[PDB]
Symmetry: C2
């Protein structure tokens, strides 16, 4: 009845990604994308063939989403969740116009962002300060997002994100069933 879209969530410091993602995947309406990771020669071949809708190098290995694998899902009306950074977001939005919905999630304050990082004991003060620097770089790209949420309350934020998702499932442009259905109401014999 409708085309699926790629649901793109980004956060400076990307903190609580596993939690917010898990909360949005629980009911099953969103599919997680299975990324190809590092043959190395197939990655370059698929990249040189424009097979990737998104690609990045993380910790010395390549990760990518294949255009074919995403296009299969969206044609069936199933939506896909992406917890990625600005670099991935810009690649998808350029490649999939009309099929992307991007949400940027901001901290209520840097003081609160620092507090959350200082509750991840596996992070030295240096790593904390490096995460703060990357957070400031990411926040500068906020204008590339359809929606921006200030995470003042995680429960409110989950509610808002779910509303964004629900709202986008009934956008006129992606509900291709509307034209024959509405013509059918207009022509129905009474």
């Amino acid at each position: 009845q409708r085309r699926g879209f790629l649901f793109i969530l980004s956060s400076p410091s990307g903190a609580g990604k596993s939690t917010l993602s898990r909360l949005l995947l629980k009911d099953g309406k969103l599919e997680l994308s299975i990324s190809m990771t590092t043959s190395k020669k197939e990655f370059k071949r698929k990249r040189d063939g424009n097979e990737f809708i998104e690609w990045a190098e993380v910790h010395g290995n390549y990760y990518g989403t294949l255009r074919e694998s995403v296009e299969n899902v969206l044609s069936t009306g199933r939506d896909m969740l992406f917890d990625i950074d600005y670099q991935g977001t810009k690649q998808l939005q350029k490649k999939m116009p009309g099929d992307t919905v991007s949400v940027f999630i901001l901290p209520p304050s840097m003081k609160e962002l620092i507090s959350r990082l200082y509750r991840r004991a596996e992070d030295s003060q240096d790593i904390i300060n490096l995460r703060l620097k990357n957070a400031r770089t990411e926040m500068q790209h906020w204008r590339s997002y359809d929606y921006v949420i200030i995470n003042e309350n995680l429960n409110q934020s989950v509610s808002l994100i779910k509303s964004i998702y629900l709202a986008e499932t009934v956008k006129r442009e992606r509900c291709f069933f509307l034209e024959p259905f509405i013509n059918g109401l207009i022509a129905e014999k009474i």
Copy 2:
């Protein structure tokens, strides 16, 4: 006024449940209802100022020549219009307005205030369901019913003017959707002008 107010436009073929959905959407107070001026004669059960301001054809004409209407249309043989001053006043406070109008008013608002309107078209699941709701509603003479059907068809011809289309299959689900559309648009980036100084605040904050 941390973000731009917007005009939340609900349209439906008469008998698809727009009026009931509007009442439920007004309950939590975030939306203010737009009161249209009208040249329709006030019905015995109506009260001026609750849904319409009932004025004369000459007074409607004079308001139109004085540019007082941000939007006006002839709907079912009577004139209806929204005063620009009433919209300006609600939106200056950063507040959102609920609108109960047809496609003619919708198109004017979208052309004058691009980006500040959110339009939702509500459809029946069938015309049989539409007729079933029209009978259950009123004193239900066949003439009024046929004519409401004709109007319903003409309004549905203009569905491409609407940002969202909802098929009213379940009333609770329909309320959930429209409320979800409302909430999503309050956090739409292009109307949150507060963002830039707040994010510059986050980037320039001392750590």
